[PDB]
């Protein structure tokens, strides 16, 4: 139920996806270049014997599962994660990883403070 105040760390030339979206995880409603969500539209969708609720619109297993897409959504999905969410990093195309340490991060709370375990990865080409 507890959300990371912060987003997961960025790696140069790497993308962090997820395998299980924990009950609590929310997904921004973000439209393509040139598109604006409807007026009085949802800013984001949310997860809730447990599935999502709300839907996006644009105009010029203990967890929920990868939501289906919507018309004219921006290519790049955007989530925010509750604690215990593992987010897995992968390198871009044209690059290659070295994993000089673990290639994942975890929303953790320590004495009341949300943090992401620093992943250890970088990509050459």
């Amino acid at each position: 139920a507890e959300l990371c105040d912060d987003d997961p760390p960025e790696i140069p030339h790497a993308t962090f996806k997820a395998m299980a979206y924990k009950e609590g995880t929310m997904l921004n409603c973000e439209c393509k270049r040139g598109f604006r969500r409807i007026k009085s539209g949802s800013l984001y969708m949310l997860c809730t014997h447990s599935s999502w609720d709300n839907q996006c619109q644009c105009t010029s297993p203990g967890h929920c599962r990868e939501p289906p897409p919507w018309e004219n959504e921006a290519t790049e999905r955007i989530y925010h994660f509750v604690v215990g969410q593992m987010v897995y990093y992968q390198c871009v195309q044209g690059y290659r990883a070295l994993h000089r340490g673990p290639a994942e991060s975890v929303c953790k709370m320590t004495h009341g403070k949300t943090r992401w375990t620093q992943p250890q990865l970088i990509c050459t080409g």
Binding site: A1, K39, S40
Partner: protein
């Protein structure tokens, strides 16, 4: 006459109801504030008369979606309560709304409509 004074009462109430929300989110002891500010709200093309409140009304649903982000309780009061009280006051003050070209931060939105309420209150008490 009397109509104007009852109107500026309703404005005072709407205005404090907004004042408290935006103090409760524009505080440093709010962690999630950044995550809120990340969302953009459609802004009125201009707000000078009461009908323009439609625009505010329209953004009311996204706005509560922002407040539900904070999961403690600076106030301690279902966000639906504030939002619905404010909605009722808005209806007590049906029309077509044109927005600004660009969206803006939750802070920016609320500054705008708070300034608007105090604007209109100062306006009426003339004569």
């Amino acid at each position: 006459s009397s109509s104007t004074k009852k109107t500026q009462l309703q404005l005072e109430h709407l205005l404090l109801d907004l004042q408290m929300i935006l103090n409760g989110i524009n505080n440093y002891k709010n962690p999630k504030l950044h995550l809120m500010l990340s969302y953009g709200f459609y802004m009125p093309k201009k707000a000078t008369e009461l009908k323009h409140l439609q625009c505010l009304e329209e953004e009311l649903k996204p706005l509560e979606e922002v407040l539900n982000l904070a999961q403690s309780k600076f106030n301690h009061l279902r966000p639906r309560d504030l939002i619905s009280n404010i909605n009722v006051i808005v209806l007590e003050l049906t029309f077509m709304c044109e927005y600004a070209d660009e969206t803006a931060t939750i802070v920016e939105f609320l500054n705008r409509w708070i300034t608007f309420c105090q604007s209109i209150i100062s306006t009426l008490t003339a004569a």
